[PDB]
């Protein structure tokens, strides 16, 4: 099997679209983004201690309106939240430094999903063979290596 | 002096330093440990973002204190 990237639009919502795509089994749909944004603000608003001005960068209500916009980018804050929500390990591989950031590594979940990051845009990763495979065992460490190879091949291209 | 840093991923990073290092130099030691680029790091302690060009212990950071790393990773 080979690890491949699936291209999602760069319409400011790529993170949300990429996440949705891998938790949902290889479903591409950029319409999930408003409700995914609405969930996020919902979670962030419900705990202004944990999501304070320091952690966020803005004030807790200010951030909730911000992320509800259709032109604002998701970042590690949204990943961490989604990780807890979907009860999943979201692994983000960087094309720029060829490294993996495992969101939810400390919780011990039973599955992990892979995203690829190039500094401004997110795309999702999947296995091909038969429908693509997007969710993997959190004990499958071959996908980690498979992604790195993928990310580095990208890195070469740039 | 030994500190702990809790990352967004959940990992608790223990950093070996002195109370007179720059925050941009903490990000340098963090990069020597996790491969995270300092231009993606945001250090925070006690509900306050730490500014580059400043030393620890300027904000009461003692040994065995817990600071916070928030990755940016914005992408759309």
Residue numbers in the entry:
A (entry chain A): 147 to 275, 280 to 308
B (entry chain B): 1 to 76
Relevant lines from the article:
Sixteen ovarian tumor (OTU) family deubiquitinases (DUBs) exist in humans, and most members regulate cell-signaling cascades. Biochemical analysis and five crystal structures of OTU DUBs with or without Ub substrates reveal four mechanisms of linkage specificity. Mechanistic and structural studies of three closely related, unstudied OTUs with distinct cleavage profiles revealed four mechanisms for achieving linkage specificity, namely (1) the use of additional Ub-binding domains (UBDs), (2) specific recognition of a ubiquitinated sequence, (3) the use of a conserved S1’ Ub-binding site on the OTU domain itself, and (4) the use of an S2 site enabling DUBs to bind longer chains in a linkage-specific manner. We selected three members of the OTUD family for additional investigation: the unstudied Lys63-specific OTUD1, the cdc48/p97 interactor OTUD2 that cleaves atypical linkages (Lys11, Lys27, Lys29, and Lys33), and OTUD3, another unstudied DUB with activity against Lys6- and Lys11-linked diUb.
In a structure of inactive OTUD2 C160A in complex with Lys11-linked diUb, the diUb molecule did not bind across the active site but occupied S1 and a previously unidentified S2 site on OTUD2. The S2 site is formed by two exposed hydrophobic residues (Ile292 and Val295) on the C-terminal OTUD2 α helix that bind the hydrophobic Ile44 patch of Ub. The orientation of Ub bound to the S2 site most likely allows preferential binding of Lys11-polyUb, given that the S2 Ub points with its C terminus toward Lys11 of the S1 Ub. The S2 site in OTUD2 is conserved in higher eukaryotes but not in yOtu1 and dmOtu1. All proteins hydrolyzed Lys11-diUb similarly, but Lys11-linked tri- and tetra-Ub were more rapidly cleaved to di- and mono-Ub by WT OTUD2, whereas OTUD2 MutS2 or dmOtu1 did not show enhanced activity for longer Lys11-linked chains. The accumulation of Lys11-linked diUb indicated that this product might be stabilized by binding the S1 and S2 sites on OTUD2, as was observed in the complex structures, although OTUD2 MutS2 did not show enhanced diUb cleavage. The S2 site specifically enhanced the cleavage of Lys11-linked polyUb, given that Lys6-, Lys48-, or Lys63-linked triUb were less well hydrolyzed by WT OTUD2 in comparison to MutS2 or were not hydrolyzed at all. Our structural studies of Ub and diUb complexes for OTUD2 unexpectedly revealed another mechanism that targets OTUD2 to longer Ub chains.
